[PDB]
Amino acid sequence: KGEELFTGVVPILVELDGDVNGHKFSVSGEGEGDATYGKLTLKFILTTGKLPVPWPTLVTTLVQCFSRYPDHMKQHDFFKSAMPEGYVQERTIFFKDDGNYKTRAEVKFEGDTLVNRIELKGIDFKEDGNILGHKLEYNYNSHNVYIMADKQKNGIKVNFKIRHNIEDGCVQLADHYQQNTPIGDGPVLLPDNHYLSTQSALSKDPNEKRDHMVLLEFVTAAGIT
Numbered sequence: 001k002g003e004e005l006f007t008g009v010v011p012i013l014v015e016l017d018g019d020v021n022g023h024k025f026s027v028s029g030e031g032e033g034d035a036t037y038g039k040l041t042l043k044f045i046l047t048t049g050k051l052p053v054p055w056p057t058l059v060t061t062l063v064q065c066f067s068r069y070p071d072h073m074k075q076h077d078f079f080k081s082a083m084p085e086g087y088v089q090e091r092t093i094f095f096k097d098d099g100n101y102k103t104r105a106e107v108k109f110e111g112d113t114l115v116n117r118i119e120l121k122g123i124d125f126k127e128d129g130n131i132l133g134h135k136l137e138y139n140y141n142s143h144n145v146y147i148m149a150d151k152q153k154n155g156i157k158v159n160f161k162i163r164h165n166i167e168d169g170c171v172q173l174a175d176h177y178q179q180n181t182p183i184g185d186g187p188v189l190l191p192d193n194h195y196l197s198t199q200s201a202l203s204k205d206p207n208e209k210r211d212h213m214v215l216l217e218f219v220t221a222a223g224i225t
Contacts, residue, residue, distance in 0.1 A: 002083035003074065006035040006065065011113045012042060014062050018049075020122030021099070021132065025049030029062060033114065035080070038068025038219045046211040053122065054136040055213040056164055059200055060093070060176060061103050063116050064145070067196050067219040076191035076224060078147075078156050078180060084109035085184030087155070093162075096173040099125030108183060130164070130172040137165040140200035149190035155181040156191065194223035 014029035026049060031042035044055075044062055065079035079087065086108025093101040105118040125132045145160045158178035163171045182188045196219050203214040 002080045003077065005083050005109065006033075006080055008036065009034045010066070012040070012063060012066075012116070013110070013113050014042065014044065014116045014118070016058065016062060016118045016120060018052075018058075018120045018122070020052045020101075020120070021125050023049065023052035025051055027058065027062065029116075033063060033066035035066045035068060038066065040066050040215065040217040040219070042215045042217075043205060043208075044213045044215065045208070051211050053125075053131050054134055054164075055138065056136050056140055056202065057095075057101075057131055057174065058120075058213075059140060059202075059215065060162060060174075061091070061101065061105070061118055061120055062213075062215070063107060063114060064089075064196065064219065065107065065114065066217075067221050069221045073194065073221050073224050075189060076194055076221065078149075078189050078191055079107075081187075081189040082107075082180075082182040082184070083114075085182065085186065087180045087182050089178065089180050091176055091178045094175040094177075095125070095129075095131055096175070098129045098131055098172075099123055106183065130166055135167050136172060137167055138202055139165055140202050141165070142197070142199045145196040145198060146193075147191060147195060148193045150179065151190060153179065153181050154188060154190070155179060192224060194221055196220065197222055 016027040029044040069077040089105040162174040
């Protein structure tokens with residue numbers, strides 16, 4: 001059923017309400033996802049406030065239902081099975097030697113559109129650290145995202161480490177702890193252990209005057225065979 005919502009291109013909306021060290025800001029995104037290819041095309045714009053953190057630090061927060069699950073792994077796609085009612089995605093992101101983000105998002109269909117609505121709270125960041133200091137390069141690495149079932153919560157537990165390249169030529173690590181729980185009461189797929197292989201390319205719209213991020217992502221599930 002939920003799988004059948006993803007047989008072609010699906011429009012996406014994203015809304016983020018952010019507060020990092022008391023600096024408040026809002027981000028809106030739009031574009032589309034095609035789970036057939038595991039491909040996301042999105043543009044994010046700062047709608048309110050000044051962006052207090054580098055755009056790359058927000059990529060993981062700003063829809064893993066668009067992951068490509070190969071035919072042999074379709075019994076392991078929690079993200080789609082939760083749809084259309086959707087899932088709650090919660091994270092803590094620990095920036096090594098710096099502050100942490102705590103996020104709560106609802107990912108669900110609002111009519112014909114997959115919508116990611118997020119609240120982010122960031123605390124205990126250093127004024128002269130890599131995040132508030134804006135020392136991260138505008139680029140993104142490929143990552144593996146590790147997934148296991150949480151039978152107790154009728155969802156999944158997700159863990160991974162993001163590597164943010166610093167302008168100095170070193171790496172700022174961001175340790176992600178994630179849990180996903182269905183919104184609806186209906187049955188969901190609890191997967192065997194597996195991962196998502198992710199690739200992200202960040203760019204700018206030459207015609208866009210506001211602070212913004214254009215993002216292209218490819219995501220494929222693997223690890224079962």
